[PDB]
Specification:
Chain A: Pfam families: KDGP_aldolase. Chain A: This is 2-dehydro-3-deoxyphosphooctonate aldolase. Chain A: It comes from Bacillus anthracis (anthrax bacterium). Chain A: InterPro entries: Aldolase_TIM, DgaF. Two copies of one chain form a homodimer. With 250 residues, chain A is of the alpha/beta class. The first copy, chain A, has a single domain, classed as Alpha-Beta Barrel (TIM Barrel), CATH 3.20.20. Helices cover 38% and strands 15% of the residues of chain A. In chain A, the strands form two sheets. An eight-stranded parallel sheet of chain A has the order 9-8-5-4-3-2-1-10. Chain A has a two-stranded antiparallel ribbon with strand order 6-7. In chain A, helix 3 links the parallel strand 3 and strand 4 (91-92). In chain A, helix 7 packs parallel to helix 8 (199-208). Chain A is globular, with a radius of gyration of 17 Å. The interface between A and B is medium-sized, with 34 and 36 residues. The complex binds chloride ion (3 copies) and sodium ion (2 copies). Residues 163-165, 191-192 of chain B line the site of one chloride ion (CL). One sodium ion is lined by residues 68-70, 72, 93 of chain A.
């Protein structure tokens, strides 16, 4: 239930980063609450300090916090799993092999956990070897999308975080991932190189494929280079695209 | 803690117990070089399994192997929960539940295996061994070493290679043993192992130089009338273990 509040008409929630709590509140207002706001484990020197900060953000934005690795950094996977013992947020970014530990560490508390799987250059197949040791291996586990989804479900995850997309560089692969998610009744979180000019196309592919729940991640493309703040005018623009598309695909 | 159970650091038996008395007799017959299986599915709830398993453990130096029950993947969630309360010495788990089980140990020391399966494709294992993944019409079929790396990322200690159907998948098993030896990872051959093929199955793993091997021997050594695992059979298996380990 908890992240469910964040989906516009039950279909699409935004995931964007915040610079600080004041930027997080401004983002949450700009998105009319249809957002989870990323706070990165790597921005704090200890688990305790991350938990304190994340709780403080959550107090302000209805716990609509997305616990981040930081650009999918697998060096933070164990830290994120540990944070989950102490704070659930609404949404957790995790690498594929760490999903099970993260779900277990929630101790039955409600949260939504994504699973990072990657493009392969082979339509229909994703790379699930996205943990520290698995990413260093001489061969990767390159598997059919639906087999990855079933494993994620068994591990306690709620969606595929499909990363790094490089915008539309892997469009044919992405369309196959969206179709597989729709077949499996599973959620999809497209991430990497999404900007204001490609956001509509990327979201439309998922909705056209009848993916039920989509969480697009939009990071540096909407961050002011000078202040480090995520731009609220940009969040408002993204929300307007979300409403336009979701209303169409209703 | 399981390290005490490996004969000369190389081989521990895994066999089932009918009851605590049979567990005690097995532990004596194997001279402690065994972890004794107690099945989660024999108890209706996690709490009842934990209570039972703790009592077995008090009698046999906590040399308990927590079981799914012939790899019943419906028990994966149960075994992951049991691990919050009791570690035993050894835990049987399906591939996608290894991480949850390690996390649930909360830092307690225990050894967790990962069930992966033959595929008919030498060099490749089926990792889709949880309830939802095994229900899929296709499986995730991956190179052995890729499965090992994933199990390591999840906090597992070995591959449980099941169901072997004895030596029906011998070529595939030889490749698994070679890969485990090359990567310094442990191996637990299971399924259809009996007194007749035990030596060959164990020899393959030791010849390949797998460092730690836990062969599982279940119904083939159980008295059909009483249900007790036979101590004379456990003694016979241990004799094979010592003969082979002394050699390799
Ligand atoms: Cl990217
Ligand atoms: Cl089992
Ligand atoms: Cl078998
Ligand atoms: Na992240
Ligand atoms: Na090497």
């Amino acid at each position: 239930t908890n992240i469910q509040k964040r989906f516009y008409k039950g279909r699409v929630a935004l995931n964007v980063l915040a610079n600080n709590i004041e930027n997080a509140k401004d983002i949450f207002e700009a998105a009319e609450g249809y957002v989870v706001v990323g706070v990165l484990s790597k921005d704090y020197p200890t688990v305790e300090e991350a938990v304190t900060a994340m709780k403080a953000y959550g107090k302000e934005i209805d716990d609509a916090v997305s616990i981040g690795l930081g650009a999918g950094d697998n060096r933070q996977a164990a830290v994120v799993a540990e944070i989950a013992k102490h704070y659930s947020g609404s949404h957790i970014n995790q690498v594929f092999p760490s999903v099970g530990a993260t779900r277990a560490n929630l101790g039955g508390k409600d949260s939504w956990i994504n699973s990072l799987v990657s493009p392969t250059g082979k339509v229909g197949y994703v790379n699930i070897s996205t943990g520290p040791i698995s990413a260093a291996g001489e061969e990767k586990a390159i598997v059919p999308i639906k087999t990855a989804i079933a494993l994620v479900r068994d591990m306690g995850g709620n969606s595929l975080k499909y990363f790094p997309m490089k915008g539309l560089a892997h469009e044919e692969e992405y369309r196959a991932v969206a179709k597989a998610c729709a077949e499996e009744g599973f959620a999809l979180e497209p991430t990497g190189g999404i900007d204001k000019e490609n956001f509509e196309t990327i979201l439309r592919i998922a909705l056209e494929a009848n993916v039920e729940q989509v969480i697009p991640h939009v990071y540096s493309s909407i961050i002011d280079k000078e202040t480090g703040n995520t731009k609220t005018e940009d969040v408002r623009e993204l929300l307007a695209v979300v409403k336009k598309l979701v209303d169409q695909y209703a």
